[PDB]
């Protein structure tokens, strides 16, 4: 018995979840949405190119005002951009050249970065002395930091390669809550608009919803066959989309607690590096390994456009708060603002 | 263009000037990736989160990075070479070392990156084959069919039955390297110990060859 008896209870519990999942799928979402007009051919053109990076861009985050954006590259530089006039507001040198994530605070007074050094470094921008200085170095993660998002000026949630997620108090520098339950390496992380929940997609082909104020895994989603590289949240806050290495994007619903759409194509073999929604959530933008991004229909599951302006792997993606621009960075050391 | 954003444009131009002056300095150094097992002794190769070491051989800067299955391997896509360290003494983990070397050689992001191979602890495998210890042919069922032992031999003399034990372990990795790759990347094998102090020159001589092949390929001389 012991482990043998406990393994039998897990199989019955797993079968009950699938049985309760099948009882809610009365009709397909693609079947129901086959009554509205398609968006047609979405044609977005490059408006300006942000040049100045000398290595592969791995991360980019929009600011709240939708004019400032911070980009992270392998040259050990954080560059804050004035996207309206192309001007560089700041150039922040980094102690480590290996950054996989970057973040912009909602207030705009702080930026974050992290990577293979397993440290979330937080830089103060609006100081005296006319310079950008590091104000906090958060340590405690074992694996490499894959994502980081600012809850506020004193709270930040990190994704890491130690199969865990963390919540930090920046003033204290301590780990307030540790989120455990995944099997594989956690690659990405998205925050709900109301901040009370967040979702993370890991290398175990699973996505888990977490409660920031409790520390427990509320839901688990398993429909993928490979590593989940990107995750985002539908502006409603009750759905999210995952991008994976199996050349397939999928949309999940929190309340339905099962998969809703599957975005796939026969001529797409490469995986998804980044995902992002639109202001209304009708358009789902995804970045791939074939040097261009694809614009999907989040309700019709049909391709509506391709943004081809990069000659290397698109690594990051970003949509403004007002929806007026889409910024795409890639491994060709350029940033393109599309419209 | 108002008065202030003209001065803000001048601030940006100073930033592009400062961004291009260290990028020239960054282009003068060579980045190396260090990989190996826990018993490989990869720290004791060049006597000089992530651990970064600096060393200079003949006035060119080198950068070696030690981290610590490997999702972060796509970060090291533009490195000059990867330094792989094998415990040639420990015959138990050698098959694991072959499987680990198989993943590095056949990786998607390392299809054009050369690997410098260091068979570490080469003195220790001598006592395992000269004195009374475990049989090498027990773990690998093809050594006793010793083949071409000393097919060509460069040593002043080290009880040449040791040399065939050295050559068989070296040939087990070159056969992996020549299995696939189509000449895009080349594995360079070496035999190293802790007392050896010529490891910095071996990477320098190999990295000179690696850059030479990339230079010869754009002139069609290879």
């Amino acid at each position: 018995s012991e482990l043998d008896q406990l393994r039998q209870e897990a199989e019955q519990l797993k079968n009950q979840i699938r049985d309760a999942r099948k009882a809610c799928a009365d009709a397909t979402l693609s079947q129901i949405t086959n009554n509205i007009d398609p968006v047609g051919r979405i044609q977005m053109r490059t408006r300006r190119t942000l040049r100045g990076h000398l290595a592969k861009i791995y991360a980019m985050h929009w600011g709240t005002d939708s004019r400032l954006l911070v980009s992270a590259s392998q040259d050990g530089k954080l560059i804050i951009w004035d996207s309206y006039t192309t001007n560089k507001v700041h150039a922040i040198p980094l102690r480590s050249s290996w950054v996989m994530t970057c973040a912009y605070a909602p207030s705009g007074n702080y930026v974050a970065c992290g990577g293979l050094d397993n440290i979330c470094s937080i830089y103060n921008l609006k100081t005296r002395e006319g310079n950008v200085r590091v104000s906090r170095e958060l340590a405690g993660h074992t694996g490499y930091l894959s994502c980081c998002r600012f809850l506020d000026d004193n709270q930040i949630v990190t994704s890491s390669g130690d199969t865990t997620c963390a919540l930090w108090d920046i003033e204290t520098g301590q780990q307030t809550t540790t989120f455990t339950g995944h099997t594989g390496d956690v690659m990405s992380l998205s925050l709900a608009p109301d901040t009370r929940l967040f979702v993370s997609g890991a290398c175990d082909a699973s996505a888990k919803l977490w409660d920031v104020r409790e520390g427990m895994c509320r839901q688990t989603f398993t429909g993928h066959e490979s590593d989940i590289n990107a995750i985002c949240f539908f502006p409603n806050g009750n759905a999210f989309a995952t991008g994976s290495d199996d050349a397939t994007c999928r949309l999940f619903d929190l309340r339905a607690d099962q998969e809703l759409m599957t975005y796939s194509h026969d001529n797409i073999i490469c995986g998804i590096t980044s995902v992002s929604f639109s202001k209304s959530g009708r358009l789902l933008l995804a970045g791939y390994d074939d040097f261009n991004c694809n614009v999907w229909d989040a309700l019709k599951a049909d391709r509506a456009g391709v943004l081809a302006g990069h000659d290397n792997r698109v690594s990051c993606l970003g949509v403004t708060d007002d929806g007026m621009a889409v910024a795409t960075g890639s491994w060709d050391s350029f940033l393109k603002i599309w419209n | 263009v108002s008065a202030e954003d003209k001065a803000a444009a001048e601030r940006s131009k100073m930033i592009d000037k400062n961004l291009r002056e260290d990028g020239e300095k960054a282009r003068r150094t060579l980045r190396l990736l260090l990989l190996g097992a826990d018993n490989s002794g990869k720290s004791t190769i060049v006597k000089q989160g992530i651990f970064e070491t600096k060393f200079q051989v003949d006035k060119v800067n080198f950068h070696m990075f030690d981290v610590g299955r490997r999702k972060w391997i796509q970060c090291f896509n533009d490195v000059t070479a990867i330094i792989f360290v094998v415990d040639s003494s420990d015959y138990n983990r050698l098959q694991e070392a072959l499987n680990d070397f198989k993943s590095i050689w056949n990786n998607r992001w390392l299809r054009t990156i050369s690997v410098i191979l260091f068979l570490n602890k080469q003195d220790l495998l001598a006592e395992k084959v000269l004195a009374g210890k475990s049989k090498i042919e027990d773990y690998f069922p093809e050594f006793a069919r010793y083949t071409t032992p000393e097919d060509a031999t460069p040593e002043p003399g080290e009880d040449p039955r040791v040399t065939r034990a050295k050559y068989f372990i070296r040939k087990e990795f070159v056969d992996i390297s020549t299995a696939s790759g189509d000449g895009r990347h080349i594995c360079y094998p070496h035999f190293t110990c802790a007392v050896d102090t010529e490891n910095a020159r071996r990477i320098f001589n190999d990295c000179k060859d690696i850059i030479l092949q990339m230079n010869l390929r754009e002139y069609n001389l290879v």
Partner: single-chain antibody
Framework: DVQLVESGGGLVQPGGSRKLSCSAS????????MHWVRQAPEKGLEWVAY????????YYADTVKGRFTISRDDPKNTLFLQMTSLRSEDTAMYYC??????????????WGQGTTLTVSSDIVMTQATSSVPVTPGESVSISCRSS???????????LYWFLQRPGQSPQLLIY???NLASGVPDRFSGSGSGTAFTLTISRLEAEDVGVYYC?????????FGAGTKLELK
């Protein structure tokens, strides 16, 4: 922490020459543009010269062009003002101002003390109010006017507000007509449109008494207002 210590001054015969200096401590002097602002005893606030960060852009006032020279030494953290062929109209106190320029920046934020030097198509800013009696606990509104529309096509209106307390260097209150400076209490506010500006004070108290100045940054030359003095009752 931030300090701008001045040196020089004295009694100079007309036709002589002086070299004022300003030592900067407590901030990154290389990334800041610098400005010289004088203040005559029988006048208000007047702008003299400007040097940019990196010394690539230098502007002078028309009264001092050709005989005044401004320069900076970034490793020494010191900027200079070489003044030649002095006249009686150059008798004033010469303040040094730091200033930075990017998106969301706050130029003219910090002023230093000044040297008392004694010699033996421009936008006009009009401050109609000169002396205003003010009681504590009340709300005082100060209005300024210009000769042009200080709003630009990028959505920016370049109007600044300064407060000169008695025996003190002027201090920035509101930059670009609407945004509050660092360390300034929230009771100060600014609003208006092109050619019509208004600074609002709510629940005025002590240490809020002085001459308020109105300054434009749309186009050099930099022109100040006449000033609006506040007094007790």
């Amino acid at each position: 922490d931030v300090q701008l210590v001045e040196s020089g001054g004295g009694l100079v015969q007309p036709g002589g020459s002086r070299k004022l200096s300003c030592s900067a401590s407590g901030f990154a002097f290389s990334s800041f543009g610098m400005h010289w602002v004088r203040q005559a005893p029988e006048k208000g606030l007047e702008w003299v010269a400007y040097i940019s960060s990196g010394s690539g852009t230098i502007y002078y006032a028309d009264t001092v062009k050709g005989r005044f020279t401004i320069s900076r030494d970034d490793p020494k953290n010191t900027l200079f003002l070489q003044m030649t062929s002095l006249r009686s109209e150059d008798t004033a106190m010469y303040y040094c101002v730091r200033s930075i320029y990017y998106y969301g920046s706050s130029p003219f934020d910090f002023w230093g003390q000044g040297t008392t030097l004694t010699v033996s198509s421009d936008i006009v800013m009009t401050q109609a109010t000169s002396s205003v009696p003010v009681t504590p606990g009340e709300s005082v509104s100060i209005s300024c006017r210009s000769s042009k529309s200080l709003l630009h096509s990028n959505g920016n209106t370049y109007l600044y507000w300064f407060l000169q307390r008695p025996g003190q260097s002027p201090q920035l209150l509101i930059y670009r007509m609407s945004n509050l400076a660092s360390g300034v209490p929230d009771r100060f506010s600014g609003s208006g449109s092109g050619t019509a500006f208004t600074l609002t004070i709510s629940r005025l108290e002590a240490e809020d008494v002085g001459v308020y100045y109105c300054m434009q940054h749309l186009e050099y030359p930099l022109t100040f207002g006449a000033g609006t003095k506040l007094e007790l009752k």
